[PDB]
Amino acid sequence: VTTYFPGYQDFVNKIRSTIENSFVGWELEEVLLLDMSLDDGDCKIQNQ
Amino acid sequence: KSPPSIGIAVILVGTSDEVAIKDAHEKDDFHHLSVVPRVELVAMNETDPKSIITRICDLMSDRKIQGVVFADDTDQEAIAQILDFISAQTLTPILGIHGGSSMIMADKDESSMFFQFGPSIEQQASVMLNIMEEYDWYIFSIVTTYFPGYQDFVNKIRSTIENSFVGWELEEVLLLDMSLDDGDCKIQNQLKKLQSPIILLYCTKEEATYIFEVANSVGLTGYGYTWIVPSLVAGDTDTVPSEFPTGLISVSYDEWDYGLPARVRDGIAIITTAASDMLSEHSFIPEPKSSCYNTHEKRIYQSNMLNRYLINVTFEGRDLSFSEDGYQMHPKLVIILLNKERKWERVGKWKDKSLQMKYYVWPRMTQDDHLSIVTLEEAPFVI
Amino acid sequence: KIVNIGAVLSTRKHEQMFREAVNQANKRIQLQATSVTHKPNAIQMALSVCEDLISSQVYAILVSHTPTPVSYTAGFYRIPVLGLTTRMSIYSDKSIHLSFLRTVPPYSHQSSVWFEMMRVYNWNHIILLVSDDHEGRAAQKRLETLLEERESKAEKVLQFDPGTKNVTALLMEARELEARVIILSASEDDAATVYRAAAMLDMTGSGYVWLVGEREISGNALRYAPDGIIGLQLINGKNESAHISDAVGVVAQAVHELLEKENITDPPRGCVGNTNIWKTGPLFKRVLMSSKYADGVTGRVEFNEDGDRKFAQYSIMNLQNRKLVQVGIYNGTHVIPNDRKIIWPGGETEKPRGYQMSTRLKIVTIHQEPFVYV
Amino acid sequence: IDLLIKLARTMQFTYEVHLVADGKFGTQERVQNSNKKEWNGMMGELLSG
Ligand SMILES: *[C@@H]1O[C@H](CO)[C@@H](O[C@@H]2O[C@H](CO)[C@@H](O[C@@H]3O[C@H](CO[C@H]4O[C@H](CO)[C@@H](O)[C@H](O[C@H]5O[C@H](CO)[C@@H](O)[C@H](O)[C@@H]5O)[C@@H]4O)[C@@H](O)[C@H](O[C@H]4O[C@H](CO)[C@@H](O)[C@H](O)[C@@H]4O)[C@@H]3O)[C@H](O)[C@H]2NC(C)=O)[C@H](O)[C@H]1NC(C)=O
Ligand SMILES: *[C@@H]1O[C@H](CO)[C@@H](O[C@@H]2O[C@H](CO)[C@@H](O[C@@H]3O[C@H](CO[C@H]4O[C@H](CO)[C@@H](O)[C@H](O)[C@@H]4O)[C@@H](O)[C@H](O)[C@@H]3O)[C@H](O)[C@H]2NC(C)=O)[C@H](O)[C@H]1NC(C)=O
Ligand SMILES: C[C@@H]([C@H](O)c1ccc(O)cc1)N1CCC(Cc2ccccc2)CC1
Ligand SMILES: *[C@@H]1O[C@H](CO)[C@@H](O)[C@H](O)[C@H]1NC(C)=O
Ligand SMILES: *[C@@H]1O[C@H](CO)[C@@H](O)[C@H](O)[C@H]1NC(C)=O
Ligand SMILES: *[C@@H]1O[C@H](CO)[C@@H](O)[C@H](O)[C@H]1NC(C)=O
Ligand SMILES: *[C@@H]1O[C@H](CO)[C@@H](O)[C@H](O)[C@H]1NC(C)=O
Ligand SMILES: [W+6]
Ligand SMILES: [W+6]
Ligand SMILES: [W+6]
Ligand SMILES: [W+6]
């Protein structure tokens, strides 16, 4: 789970490429992106 | 002295042709009954509990109202429930023939004598499943509220599915709570848990507007999603909410072929035939209560026997009989579809356990996600 | 800013109690008390609800001991009803009673104690006897729920037609089973009929345990109730005044929390010509359902998902020498046995074992080719 | 049968052997009305007492 805070792409990609090049049974089930620039009255964040 | 006259109060609410109604209820004089109906039409503006109770009780205090034929132009099931309550407390035969009073009410009172001119929830559900068979819509989900009858609905669907060799796929069953508010976005999530292309929605029209609104907010009202609803959802075909999705299939009453004066006449015929069948099997008729204030004292003197004669009325070659739960045994149903013009159009008919649809292939919008594919019979590739 | 609370109570005295509770709520927007007493019948009761209460725009209606017409009428508008003394399970059905809460638990929740009592005594095999009405079925469903929240099982469930005076068949149906622990749910007069038949059927002596609720040890049902029976009584369950006090505190708290919000509309006034629900009704209801009052006269008042009071406390009562004796209490989740010893229905004072295995076991088989030749 | 004799030998109990009222073993099926799950067969007799 990340927000739009700078770095989040570096983070997710670092994970994805550490995983990809490994002989280990890693399993990334979900990657969420949360928009903290909007209000959360539509409960989007909650549903994520 | 003389053939006894029973008091049948015909209550009409809203715009209604009293002339045509009285001309179709007094013309055909019936002499095949052991009793003659004394029809007395009464009008009423409001449909609140106090107004209905007061009007009916006063109608029973003034004249000897043996039966009460009720009709309205609204879409309030609460009317039918109130009528069931009155019919339970006063043990007075009440017939909801049109409007919200005709909207089905499940689990009526034990001593209720309130019958409705409408199909049962189980029967409507069965018709829905039959429609899903006619167009091979095997994969579907069900969304019901806490409205009385959701249990009977879902259980009917399940019972029909289990004992069938048809590959039914009941993905999700949602139980939306309308008793509380929806600020926690619970309903939104429940509806978001829907995956099926066909959704069976069971609730009130007022609730249906909200549910359709939320579903539209999620994205379940557009093309690729077909909603099917009972009668109490659509209701008045001349009143369509903006929240209702275009392509909404619904099972309703054949209001075109079954007019309001015909409904009044049939109800009067039911009460009269019941009274006659009782006066020829026990030689007496329950005395009409002239007060709603003393229905607790003369409770041991009042009976619930007319039901066994009200549940079984054959008139003019038509079987206008009811059921123990308080619904019509053999109702003439009509399958209507909401078009792009936001109007209800008859696209099917249900009669005598037979389903006759208008179109062979269901008219879906030829989008860029729908293709027509041809194949040739060749074993084992195409068997 | 004036928020009316309504109430249908037993007497003018309890009316004055309601009034004083409301006055106190004001002391502790300002509330005004409006109340009436019960009408002689359901129609007059509904009409009274409209003309006397809803006519004053009540946000809620307290109801004491047939609340049904009040629940229906108020629910028409989605005006919440707070039952002060009704325990019937039918008011827990959201389908029928849309906006009904109560400061007492329904009879059927006694099953939880029964369940805890089975834990309190390691009864793994039990016979259930229920009346074939709504309350009986509610109790059955609820106990089967408690039994199948932890693998526990019902050896049999018996149902009887209410008003049946000879229940010998059913009890003979219960004699044939192994389990000697017997649980009963029935009205007063039916409790009486079962107790009578049971005794005549000699099921009240050594070996048998009888576990029951409140209705089955009340009034006339006590006159013929066997000795050593274990039963329950809802603590404070009959003090209308206390429940009025607490209901008024909870409703005042809920009113103020509700008015802590925005876009609050007033409830409907007169009935005549009004057919739309109170728009703020479901939210006010949500507020009551989730209200919390820690310092209540009757203990800790909270509501569960059905709007039934939760965390109720029960006295566990034992009939000793035809006298009702308190042998314990049920708190929230745990049974507490007091210094007074339980005298069981049967021989000695030792806790019986409801698992008397029969010497004759009817073995069943089917004609199979290599195993069972017939 | 011999196995039942062995069980009766190990654990002392009197037995009243009988056959199934039908011809099946024990499978769950729907009721005639109200859709109620009811087992039919040997288990249908075992659950009914
Ligand atoms: C309270 O509850 C107790 C139960 O503990 C009651 O005792 C029970 O009473 C019933 C009724 O008398 C006893 O009867 C069993 O009844 C059936 C069916 O029929 C009876 O009812 C018929 C109408 O439905 C009626 O036509 C029958 O009469 C004809 O046939 C008999 C012969 O069967 C004949 O003698 C008559 O002259 C009639 O021609 C009959 O009255 C019956 O078939 C049962 O029988 C078999 O099994 C018994 C042994 O169980 C055996 O003795 C019989 O010969 C037969 O093989 C049986 O009689 C029932 O037995 C009673 N149960 C007990 C435990 O005593 C009690 O009456 C209730 N009292 C009150 C005040 O409520
Ligand atoms: C109503 O009276 C009840 C008395 O029967 C009260 O229940 C008791 O509450 C006390 C206080 O918490 C408990 O004592 C503590 O128990 C905890 C939990 O350990 C036990 O339970 C866990 C599972 O939750 C289990 O794994 C353990 O093996 C224990 O059995 C301990 O951690 C503490 O050290 C301490 O012992 C009692 O155990 C408990 N009694 C029973 C029978 O449950 C209840 O709190 C009262 N209610 C109110 C509102 O006061
Ligand atoms: C409980 C609701 C209803 O069942 C319901 C509505 C919406 C739901 O989502 C779920 C349920 N009713 C109860 C009875 C009320 C009528 C009434 C009033 C006074 C006397 C007799 C009868 C009208 C509304
Ligand atoms: C209400 O009823 C009265 C007579 O009963 C009628 O005059 C009046 O027009 C009605 N109200 C409306 C809005 O039509
Ligand atoms: C209904 O009426 C018909 C008319 O003859 C009769 O034959 C039938 O028995 C009636 N049904 C019941 C259940 O009484
Ligand atoms: C309520 O009644 C009970 C008696 O069972 C007792 O607590 C007292 O009499 C009353 N309590 C209050 C606070 O009035
Ligand atoms: C409350 O807000 C809603 C909009 O979501 C709307 O009904 C209106 O703005 C407010 N209601 C009233 C009665 O002002
Ligand atoms: W002040
Ligand atoms: W002040
Ligand atoms: W002040
Ligand atoms: W001031």
Indicate the DSSP class of residue B287. P
Give yes or no: residues C138 and C180 share one domain. yes
- Residue B98 annotated as binding? yes
- What is the CATH classification number for the domain harbouring C41? 3.40.50.2300
Contact C44, B293 (CB under 8 A): yes
Residue B124, CA distances (Å) to B119, B315, B373 in order:
6, 24, 34
Contact B321, B274 (CB under 8 A): no
Spell out which residues of chain D touch residue B126, defining contact as CB-CB under 8 Å. none
Best B186, B188, B194, B216 residue to mutate vs chain A (most A CBs within 10 Å) = B188
Give yes or no: residues C115 and C218 share one domain. yes
Rounded distance, CA B205 to CA B49, Å? Answer: 19
Q: How would you label D10-44 residue by residue, b for 16+ Cβ within 10 Å and e otherwise?
A: eeeeeeeeeebeeeeebeeeeeeeeeeeeebbbbb
Contact B190, B182 (CB under 8 A): no
Backbone angles phi, psi at D29, to 5 degrees: -145, 160
Spell out which residues of chain D touch residue C360, defining contact as CB-CB under 8 Å. 13-16
Rounded distance, CA C260 to CA B337, Å? Answer: 45
Across the interface, of D13, D17, D23, the residue whose CB is closest to C365 is: D17
Largest CA distance in chain A: 43
Rounded distance, CA C83 to CA C196, Å? Answer: 33
Contact B326, B105 (CB under 8 A): yes
Which D positions 1-49 lie with beta carbon below 8 A of chain C? Answer: 1, 4, 13-20, 23, 25, 42, 45-46, 49
Residues in chain A: 48
Rounded distance, CA B127 to CA B148, Å? Answer: 19
- Decide if B85 touches C, using CB distance below 8 A: yes
Report residue C144 as tokens: 């089967």
Report residue B119 as tokens: 């199909």
Q: Identify how many contiguous H helices and E strands chain A contains and give both numbers.
A: 2, 2
User: Hey, is B259 helix, strand or coil?
Assistant: coil
CB atoms within 10 A of CB B357: 16
Rounded distance, CA B75 to CA B232, Å? Answer: 7
Find, among B138, B98, B146, B143, the residue nearest to B118 by Cα: B98
Give the CATH class of B120-253+332-367: alpha beta
Contact C134, C169 (CB under 8 A): no
Rounded distance, CA B241 to CA C252, Å? Answer: 38
Q: What value, to the nearest 5°, has the Cα angle with vertex A33 and ends A32 and A38? A: 135
Residue C315, CA distances (Å) to C261, C330, D38 in order:
40, 6, 39
Give yes or no: residues C136 and C11 share one domain. no
CA of residue C244 to ligand 6 center, whole Å = 12
Contact B352, B330 (CB under 8 A): yes
The residues with which C2 forms a beta bridge, in sequence order, are C30
Rounded distance, CA B328 to CA D36, Å? Answer: 25
**What was the experiment behind these coordinates?**
X-ray
Four-residue CA torsion sign, C225, C229, C234, C239: positive
Distance from CA of C157 to the nearest CA of D (A): 10
Mutate to test the pocket of ligand 1, among C168, C170, C193, C200 (most ligand atoms within 8 A of CB): C168
Give yes or no: residues C277 and C338 share one domain. no
Contact C336, C320 (CB under 8 A): no
Indicate the DSSP class of residue B322. B
Chain breaks in chain C (C to N over 2.5 A) after: 28, 65
Direct distance between the N- and C-terminal alpha carbons of chain D, in angstroms, rounded to an integer: 21
Name, in order, each residue with C-beta under 8 angstroms of C97's C-beta and a sequence gap of 6 or more: C71, C72, C75, C81, C90, C91
Rounded distance, CA C339 to CA C349, Å? Answer: 14
Contact B285, B278 (CB under 8 A): yes
User: Hey, is B73 helix, strand or coil?
Assistant: coil
- Break chain D down into helix, strand, coil percent, rounded to 5: 30, 30, 45
Cis peptide before B380 (omega within 30 of 0): yes
Contact C152, C111 (CB under 8 A): no
Give yes or no: residues C322 and C184 share one domain. yes
Contact C18, C33 (CB under 8 A): yes
Q: Which ligand is nearest to the CA of C331?
A: 2
Residue C241 CA: nearest ligand 6 atom is 14
CB atoms within 10 A of CB B202: 28
Rounded distance, CA C196 to CA C207, Å? Answer: 18
Rounded distance, CA C312 to CA B193, Å? Answer: 36
Largest CA distance in chain C: 87
Indicate the DSSP class of residue B361. S
Give yes or no: residues C213 and C278 share one domain. no
CA of residue C16 to ligand 11 center, whole Å = 23
Give yes or no: residues C140 and C251 share one domain. no
* Count of CA atoms in the C-beta half-sphere (13 A) of C11: 5
Contact criterion met (CB < 8 Å) for C76 and B78: yes
Rounded distance, CA C364 to CA D47, Å? Answer: 12
Which C positions 283-322 lie with beta carbon below 8 A of chain B? Answer: 283, 285-286, 289
Distance of CA B291 to the CA centre of its chain: 30
Find, among C305, C276, C311, the residue nearest to C293 by Cα: C311
User: Hey, is B67 helix, strand or coil?
Assistant: strand
Rounded distance, CA B47 to CA B71, Å? Answer: 11
Find, among C87, C103, C95, C69, the residue nearest to C139 by Cα: C87
Contact B286, B305 (CB under 8 A): yes
Distance of CA C64 to the CA centre of its chain: 14
Name, in order, each residue with C-beta under 8 angstroms of C207's C-beta and a sequence gap of 6 or more: C180, C346, C347, C352, C356
Give yes or no: residues C55 and C164 share one domain. no
Contact criterion met (CB < 8 Å) for C43 and B86: yes
Contact B149, B106 (CB under 8 A): yes
Chain breaks in chain A (C to N over 2.5 A) after: none
Three-state SS across chain C? CEEEEEEEECCHHHHHHHHHHHHHHHHCCEEEEEEEECCCCHHHHHHHHHHHHHHHCEEEEEECCCCHHHHHHHHHCCCCEEECCCCCHHHHCCCCCCCEEECCCCHHHHHHHHHHHHHHHCCCEEEEEEECCHHHHHHHHHHHHHHCCCCCEEEEEEEECCCCCCCHHHHHHHHCCCCCEEEEECCHHHHHHHHHHHHHCCCCCCCCEEECCCHHHCCHHHHCCCCCCEEEEECCCCCHHHHHHHHHHHHHHHHHHHCCCCCCCCCCCCCCCCCCCCCCHHHHHHHHHCCCEEEECCEEEEECCCCEEECCCEEEEEEECCEEEEEEEECCCCEEECCCCCCCCCCCCCCCCCCCCCCEECCEECCECCCECC
Name, in order, each residue with C-beta under 8 angstroms of C245's C-beta and a sequence gap of 6 or more: C17, C21, C297
Backbone angles phi, psi at B102, to 5 degrees: -90, -15
Indicate the DSSP class of residue B362. -
Residues in chain B: 383
Question: Which secondary-structure segment (H or E) carries B345?
Answer: strand B344-351
Q: What is the DSSP string of B8-52?
A: EEEEEESS--HHHHHHTTSSS---SSSSEEEEEEEEES--SHHHH
Contact criterion met (CB < 8 Å) for B48 and C285: no
Query: Would you tell me the crossing angle of helices C240-258 and C281-289 to the nearest 10 degrees?
Result: 120
Best B179, B206, B210 residue to mutate vs chain C (most C CBs within 10 Å) = B179
Rounded distance, CA C142 to CA C111, Å? Answer: 7
Find, among B23, B234, B28, B213, the residue nearest to B118 by Cα: B234
Residue B271, CA distances (Å) to B322, C116, C281 in order:
12, 55, 39
Question: B1-119+254-331 belongs to which homologous superfamily?
Answer: Response regulator (3.40.50.2300)
Rounded distance, CA B173 to CA B125, Å? Answer: 14
Mutate to test the pocket of ligand 3, among B47, B56, B81 (most ligand atoms within 8 A of CB): B81
Rounded distance, CA C279 to CA C266, Å? Answer: 8
Containing domain of residue C157, as a range? 106-238+312-349
Indicate the DSSP class of residue B250. E
Direct distance between the N- and C-terminal alpha carbons of chain B, in angstroms, rounded to an integer: 78
Contact C99, B179 (CB under 8 A): yes
Question: Which secondary-structure segment (H or E) carries B337?
Answer: strand B333-338
- Tell me the one-letter amino acid at C231: G
Four-residue CA torsion sign, B92, B97, B99, B105: positive
Distance from CA of D13 to the nearest CA of C (A): 5
Name, in order, each residue with C-beta under 8 angstroms of A29's C-beta and a sequence gap of 6 or more: none
Rounded distance, CA A43 to CA D48, Å? Answer: 51
Rounded distance, CA C147 to CA C144, Å? Answer: 5
* Strand pairing report for C2-9 and C30-37: parallel
Ligand 3 pocket residue status of C73, Cβ below 6 Å = yes
Contact B269, B117 (CB under 8 A): no
Residues in chain C: 374
Q: Do B120-253+332-367 and B1-119+254-331 have the same topology in CATH?
A: yes
Name, in order, each residue with C-beta under 8 angstroms of B125's C-beta and a sequence gap of 6 or more: B153, B156, B157, B160, B200, B230
Mutate to test the pocket of ligand 7, among C263, C266, C279 (most ligand atoms within 8 A of CB): C263
Q: Is C57 left (phi over 0), alpha (psi -120 to 50) or beta?
A: left
CA of residue C120 to ligand 2 center, whole Å = 14
* Count of CA atoms in the C-beta half-sphere (13 A) of C333: 0
- Tell me the one-letter amino acid at B155: N
Contact criterion met (CB < 8 Å) for C360 and D13: yes
Strand order in the sheet with C30-37: C30-37, C2-9, C58-63, C81-83, C100-102
Q: What value, to the nearest 5°, has the Cα angle with vertex B194 and ends B188 and B198? A: 125
Rg (CA), chain B: 23
Give yes or no: residues C341 and C286 share one domain. no
* Resolution of the experimental model, in Å, one decimal: 4.0
Largest CA distance in chain D: 46
* Strand pairing report for B169-176 and D18-19: unpaired
Rounded distance, CA C59 to CA C278, Å? Answer: 9
Find, among B322, B302, B346, B370, the residue nearest to B102 by Cα: B322
Give yes or no: residues C306 and C329 share one domain. no
The residue with tokens 């879902």 is: B154
Give yes or no: residues C208 and C338 share one domain. yes
Across the interface, of C41, C69, C285, the residue whose CB is closest to B180 is: C285
Contact C61, C275 (CB under 8 A): no
Rounded distance, CA B67 to CA B94, Å? Answer: 6
Q: What value, to the nearest 5°, has the Cα angle with vertex C89 and ends C86 and C92? A: 95
Contact C108, C130 (CB under 8 A): no
Distance from CA of B159 to the nearest CA of D (A): 6
Contact B59, B51 (CB under 8 A): no
Contact criterion met (CB < 8 Å) for B155 and D35: yes
Four-residue CA torsion sign, C248, C254, C256, C258: negative
Question: Which secondary-structure segment (H or E) carries B97?
Answer: strand B94-98
CB atoms within 10 A of CB B14: 14
Contact C281, C268 (CB under 8 A): no
Contact B73, B101 (CB under 8 A): no
The residue with tokens 């099972």 is: B251
Find, among C24, C100, C37, the residue nearest to C64 by Cα: C37
Contact criterion met (CB < 8 Å) for C360 and D14: yes
Rounded distance, CA C300 to CA B320, Å? Answer: 56
CA of residue C169 to ligand 1 center, whole Å = 12
Contact criterion met (CB < 8 Å) for D17 and C176: no
Q: What value, to the nearest 5°, has the Cα angle with vertex B327 and ends B322 and B328? A: 55
Rounded distance, CA B273 to CA B288, Å? Answer: 17
Give yes or no: residues C63 and C135 share one domain. no
Distance from CA of C372 to the nearest CA of D (A): 7
Rounded distance, CA C99 to CA B146, Å? Answer: 12
